[PDB]
Design a protein around this ligand. Structure first.
Ligand SMILES: OC[C@H]1O[C@@H](O[C@H]2[C@H](O)CNO[C@@H]2CO)[C@H](O)[C@@H](O)[C@@H]1O
Length: 300
């Protein structure tokens, strides 16, 4: 129903809109690393998230390093499983080239270009797909102008040769927080968005003001990852600040995916140890984070 109704997504005046020009807000879940917690990514779990939580997007977080794709490329097949499930379930899907320790997206740029060539060749005639080409550029030696923008200007053409207008999300500096610099030096492609990531354990008032600055330059922002935890993915749950961010995102038409769908013993994990990898979770099988996130999506 979601993808049939909204169809082709695009950016209009810095906003994500559907094929009839109406603003649309995506809200869903990210997997954790597919090399570690891939069992939670399947048609049945995604159907349960769609039906019971109300998700309309799913993010497939394919780590490149940390035992991910570069080390063992078999994980690309799990991305394919996820995309196919989203197509079957009529929801949107984010294909995330999930850089992190490999902090400069240029490190694996050749591999990224080949990967996105393949993905866009396979799926480029479906409206479900959103390409996230570099999760979290980070480090003082990785800047928008010198590293990230030129990387994007190599990878985007590869995608566009197969898929001329599905959305592409481009990571920003400082673990996808530096939307200010991106917004002042935007990419040419009209269907690009810049990633912004937050963790509720960080006091967020200036970060919200920076997102507003970026929006005011006409840049579109996708909150492609956020957590209820501290920035590590752990360290307690911060639901008061998470709610402030939720309300902020609603007011600003910002789409989002929550980190993450796993049973790992960390505060950001949505599931308890014991949760069935194919869905059907009772309230006792959701963590405090998962309970909150599910409520936010159901409310929406
Ligand atoms: O892989 C290191 C670490 O990653 C955390 O997840 C991060 C994600 O990869 C990028 N955005 O920030 C989040 C939080 O730091 C996981 O939560 C950890 O379990 C994992 O060890």
């Amino acid at each position: 129903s979601v993808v049939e109704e909204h169809g082709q997504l695009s950016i209009s005046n810095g906003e994500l809109v559907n094929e009839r020009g109406e603003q649309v807000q995506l809200k869903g879940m990210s997997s954790h690393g597919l090399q570690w917690y891939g069992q939670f990514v399947n048609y049945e779990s995604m159907k349960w998230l769609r039906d019971d939580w109300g998700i309309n997007v799913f993010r497939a977080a394919m780590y490149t390093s940390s035992g991910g794709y570069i080390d063992d490329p078999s994980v690309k097949e799990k991305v394919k499983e996820a995309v196919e499930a989203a197509i079957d379930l009529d929801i949107y899907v984010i294909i995330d080239w999930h850089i992190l320790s490999d902090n400069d997206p240029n490190i694996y740029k050749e591999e990224a270009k080949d990967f996105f060539d393949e993905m866009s060749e396979l799926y480029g005639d479906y409206p479900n797909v959103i390409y996230e080409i570099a999760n979290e550029p980070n480090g003082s030696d990785v800047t928008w102008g010198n590293q990230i923008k030129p990387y994007a200007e190599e990878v985007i053409p590869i995608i566009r040769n197969n898929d001329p207008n599905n959305i592409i999300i481009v990571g920003t500096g400082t673990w996808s927080q530096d939307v200010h610099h991106a917004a002042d030096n935007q990419l040419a492609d009209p269907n690009v968005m810049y990633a912004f990531h937050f963790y509720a354990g960080t006091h967020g008032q200036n970060l919200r003001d920076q997102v507003d600055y970026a929006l005011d330059q006409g840049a579109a922002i996708f909150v492609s990852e956020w957590g209820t935890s501290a920035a590590t993915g752990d360290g307690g749950v911060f639901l008061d600040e998470a709610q402030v961010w939720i309300d902020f995102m609603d007011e600003r038409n910002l789409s989002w995916a929550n980190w993450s769908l796993t049973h790992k013993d960390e505060s950001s994990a949505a599931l308890m140890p014991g949760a069935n990898p194919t869905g059907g979770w009772t309230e006792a099988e959701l963590s405090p984070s998962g309970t909150f996130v599910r409520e936010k999506i159901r409310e929406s």
